[PDB]
Design a binder for these strands. Structure first.
Lengths: 183, 182, 182, 183
DNA sequence: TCAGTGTCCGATAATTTAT
DNA sequence: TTATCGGACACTG
DNA sequence: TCAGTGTCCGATAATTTAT
DNA sequence: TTATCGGACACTG
DNA sequence: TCAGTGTCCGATAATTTAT
DNA sequence: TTATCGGACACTG
DNA sequence: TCAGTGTCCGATAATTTAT
DNA sequence: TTATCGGACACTG
């Protein structure tokens, strides 16, 4: 009954807001909502790490979808098991299912398990996608901003780099690089 | 390299059916590994060892799901581990293996369905403890010492470092029989 | 308005335990329907009747999944029929209901898991008998008629009707004992 | 392996090609690929009907994803029952499994079971969707086309309905309804 | 009254492949 | 995944 | 060389309740 | 669970 | 030769709600 | 889900 | 009124194989 | 799966 929220994001679609509104619509107050922008690091999840420090027997954490609490089924089951012993349950808003009962945890598991397999089948199709596009001749990576014909045409003209980097507005690091590559 | 694993938790120590089934499947005694729950923490030292002696390409065998893993959490981790190591599990009766992605899923599912049905039995077993507990069924090891001779000889005056020598019981139990019977 | 349903398929006709559970659950005996599968094609009249006598709002109780249904297809059908008719099923031991969307899914999954486990047991039993027609083992009902009193009487010049009257057996059999003992 | 294909479509996204492509890519001849586009009417899947009349023992039908062959899970489980007692088996490309074995069927069943659940959950959100908009004020249905301020302005004037529906290009049914509906 | 050149990374910024 | 940015150094004179 | 008396746990052994 | 088995202390006179 | 009038559908077409 | 077409009827004058 | 004789099934009871 | 009961024929003279 001592309600808590949790929201998480992993891509450009930082609609963390859309998550937090979903949380507040469900009666969780800003007071006890915990956020995580997974900066792509091994496991730098501060928000959560702070959530399990304040919850005590009685409380109920809320999350919007399954694939938020946990990246992978193995991790997520441990989390639930911990909490359970601690005396706290998790309610999933969109899935409309929850950890308080036994057939509850069962469904949760069954559900994220079908997720993970689907997740992985996509991951493979995405890597082959890169191969039949990479060998195809498609170009990957940041589009080139710099007018390089304006670097060659300025160095072959006598002038030194420090000068070139100031008149044009770019780092000197780049100027020399542009030179050594065009041989 | 093929490996076996068998485990037991109750009086039905047919570790033999398991160990035989594994042999039939082609596992040499040489690499079959055994554990038998004494009811301690997780002194599954036989398992602990088997996972030391495995390398990329090895395959472990087990007769049924609920052997390897007690709870689905513990189970999934063990596979997550073995998998990283380059090793797979093939379950004989359940007829599936951690070999593929779908494989793992079906394992994960079946244990999850098991744990569930296994929990309901526990709570049912427990509810039944109470419909015979208050009914009047006595619990414990059945009494064996003749208590109509311990109190019959102590009240006569004979010492307590002598009555345990006449009969065949410990000196701890004579003082327990006297004190408790008030 | 509550209803019950119990069913039985083997010697363990503890059809009572079921109806005790359905009365302990709060169904009036008025509303507890019953069937007992002889093993014939499909003679479940009790159900046939129940599904005629229920209206929107009613709930049917049943003790375990594997009662309402032999196989998972039938199982879903029954549910579907009831569903469009304003009635829902509640499985006791299992502790789930066809009340909701998730509700039905869970049921479906469970039966599917069960069916697989069921067809594996069938193929094992089926290899079990096969591989035990190599040693003994003697199948069939145990012989009762004194066959050493039939030959012993027929070689004595006596005729088959006499032998059927004297020993209280069928003339069908008199000849069969003989023609199957050369 | 008598190979066969099957593709199906239910919305504007009639990318029937993508499916038929997937099938050919997987190794079916157009010679044995079969096609159905539902029109929303009761049930008119004449294409499948045809194919299950032409298969025999040994044959294998291919399909791109689960939700193509079967609408609801019973209907799905029944086709398979039919096909099974016939000596055919279905392979699902993207889901990477087939009715081939016992465990096979189980997985198929479990998966569509999940599908149908999450599909109904979507559908009820679509329907509470038209409610946070129905009572919000929005008007549903076809946009009104007949100029009504010329039907009533022509009727109080006195003229009969028959003359009203002949002058303006409207059916006499619509005249009466418009009148009876607005007073 | 120190100052200019050129090299070598780790951060940071935009970009592709897929449901 | 490739591009640029901002600095840290190690040289020269 | 007490030399016995009395209490107070940590191991084991035999049991019960249920699929 | 409850019953026994072997001890370890902490005191006696 | 009705010949005009008013009602009550089943079919179609055009629309909105959403992942 | 609401807006129109075409008809099918059952009446009147 | 035969009156007797043998052969060949379909239904059930008992009994096996396994969880 | 087998063992047996009650019969339904087909034969028998």
């Amino acid at each position: 009954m001592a309600l808590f929220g949790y929201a998480r994001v992993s891509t450009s679609q930082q609609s963390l807001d859309i998550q937090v509104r979903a949380l507040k619509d469900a009666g969780v107050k800003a007071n006890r909502i915990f956020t995580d922008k997974a900066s792509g690091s091994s496991s730098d999840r501060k928000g959560l790490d702070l959530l399990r420090m304040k919850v005590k027997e009685g409380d109920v954490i809320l999350v919007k979808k399954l694939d938020r609490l946990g990246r992978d089924t193995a991790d997520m089951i441990q989390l639930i098991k911990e909490f359970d012993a601690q005396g706290v349950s998790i309610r999933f808003i969109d899935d409309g299912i929850s950890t308080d009962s036994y057939i509850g945890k069962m469904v949760v598991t069954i559900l994220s398990a079908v997720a993970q397999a689907e997740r992985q089948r996509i991951l493979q199709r995405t890597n082959e996608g890169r191969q039949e596009a990479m060998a195809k001749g498609v170009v990957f990576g940041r589009k080139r901003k710099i007018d390089r014909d304006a670097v060659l045409n300025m160095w072959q003209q006598g002038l030194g780099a420090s000068h070139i980097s100031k008149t044009m507005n770019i780092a000197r690091s780049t100027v020399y690089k542009v030179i050594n590559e065009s041989n």
